[PDB]
Paper text:
Birt–Hogg–Dubé syndrome (BHD) is an inherited genetic disorder that predisposes individuals to renal cell carcinoma (RCC), benign skin tumours and lung cysts that lead to recurrent spontaneous pneumothorax. In this study, we use structural and biochemical analyses to show that folliculin is probably a distant relative of the differentially expressed in normal cells and neoplasia (DENN) family of guanine nucleotide exchange factors (GEFs) and demonstrate that it possesses in vitro nucleotide exchange activity towards Rab35 GTPase. Through structure–function analyses, we report that folliculin, which is commonly mutated in patients suffering from these malignancies, has an unusual architecture that classes it into an ancient family of proteins called the DENNs.
In order to understand the essentiality of the C-terminal region (amino acids 341–566) and reveal the function of full-length folliculin, we have determined at 2 Å resolution the three-dimensional structure of the C-terminal domain of folliculin, henceforth called folliculin-CT. We have calculated phases by the multi-wavelength anomalous dispersion (MAD) method using anomalous scatterers from selenomethionine (see §4). The folliculin-CT crystallized in C2221 space group with two molecules in the asymmetric unit related by twofold non-crystallographic symmetry. The fold of folliculin-CT is dominated by an αβ architecture with a core β-sheet and helices packed on the one side, followed by an all-helical region. Interestingly, folliculin-CT shares remarkable structural similarity with the DENN domain of the DENN1B-S protein; both proteins have the same order and orientation of strands. Although the sequence identity is only 11 per cent, a structural alignment using the program Baton (based on Comparer) shows a r.m.s.d. of 2.8 Å over its 170 core-aligned residues, corroborating the strong similarity and probable homology. The truncated folliculin polypeptide chain found in BHD syndrome is missing the c-DENN and d-DENN modules, and retains only the u-DENN region—which is the only part of the DENN homology region that is kept in the more compact yeast folliculin orthologue, LST7.
Numbering used by the authors: 343 to 445, 459 to 472, 477 to 524, 528 to 558
The structure:
Amino acid sequence: LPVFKSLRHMRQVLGAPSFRMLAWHVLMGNQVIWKSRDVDLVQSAFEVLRTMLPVGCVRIIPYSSQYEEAYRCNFLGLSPHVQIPPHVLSSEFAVIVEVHAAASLSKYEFVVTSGSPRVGPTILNKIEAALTNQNLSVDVVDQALVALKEEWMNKVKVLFKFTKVPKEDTQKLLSILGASEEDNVKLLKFWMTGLS
């Protein structure tokens, strides 16, 4: 009963700024750390978050008793008293979500942190915007995410096929495809790991 049910639910619970920072890290392939007493809640978090990535981009250690580095996983679950190394705590390339009992999910308080820095990537804005509109049916949200994800994976394919070979050509192509901006370029690079 105390689990995340959707992206939208997760957004309601964590809050808008926190969700956006969390989602940006998921999308870019940065390490996502969840520290909780509750194994199932954490599993539900990952089940929800993974829907934002191509299935090939997911490497999960669901509930570890020690910190594991990024090469080990991009999704990491943790026991409550596990200690996170300083480089992680201050990293701009990881996000930590810590769950505690508070004084759906009312009994928990969530704190989301990351090393301090943005505008994109585009799929994030589009995803956040869909979650935002409370007038959206669940099926619409779900089907839109699938589509959005597919559109972005296609761009990855197009980009891979294209750079099988000037160099300024790539930016030009990307520009037509609406994917020239710095974050979009970073996302495509990461998403390419989800392809052979």
